[PDB]
Every structure is written in C-alpha cells, then in structure tokens.
C-alpha cells in the first residue's frame, strides 16, 4: 500500500544521506593516507639523496 511504500521511501532517503556522509568521510580518510604516502616518499628520497651525496663520498674519502 501507499503507506508502506512511503515509510520505506523515507527510511531509504535517510539512509542514503548517511551513506553519502559515510563515503565523504571515507574519501577524507583516503586523502589523509595520500598525504601520508607523499610525506613518506619525500622522506625516502631524502634518504637516497643523503646516501649518494654524503655517505658515499665520505666512504671513498675514508680511504685516503
């Protein structure tokens, strides 16, 4: 009946708004992980750069 369909429709509309808010928060979480990954990648490049520019030259130098 119409009464049943309408209550279900209202319940579903409310659930849809919660799903939308949930995905928005999930997307925000993923964006945070992307930022973390970028920061970590930057740190790893710094590690590579330190090894090649400071550590390596110093090892060779330690021979003379």
């Amino acid at each position: 009946t119409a009464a049943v369909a309408l209550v279900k429709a209202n319940e579903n509309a409310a659930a849809i708004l919660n799903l939308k808010n949930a995905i928005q928060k999930t997307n925000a979480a993923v964006a945070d992980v992307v930022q973390a990954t970028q920061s970590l990648g930057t740190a790893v490049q710094a590690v590579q750069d330190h090894i090649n520019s400071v550590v390596s030259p110093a090892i060779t130098a330690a021979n003379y």
Partner: protein, 38 residues
C-alpha cells in the same frame, strides 16, 4: 682534518606521516558512525 658527516633528519616528514594516518583513522571512525545510523 677530515670532512664531518651531517646527521640525516627526516623526523619532520615521519611526524607528518603519523599525524596524517591518525587523521585517516579518525575519519574512518566517523564514516563507520554514519553507517551505523543505518
């Protein structure tokens, strides 16, 4: 004399990583709260 070796410091990048991950977990908790309202 010999050349000194500057200590590598990526502590700030690492701190940023941990803060971002904490924010991610907080957001996931909020997402789950909305899902529970269903």
């Amino acid at each position: 004399q010999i050349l000194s070796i500057d200590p590598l410091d990526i502590s700030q990048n690492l701190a940023a990583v941990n803060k971002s991950l904490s924010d991610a977990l907080q957001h996931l908790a909020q997402s789950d709260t909305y899902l529970s309202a269903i």
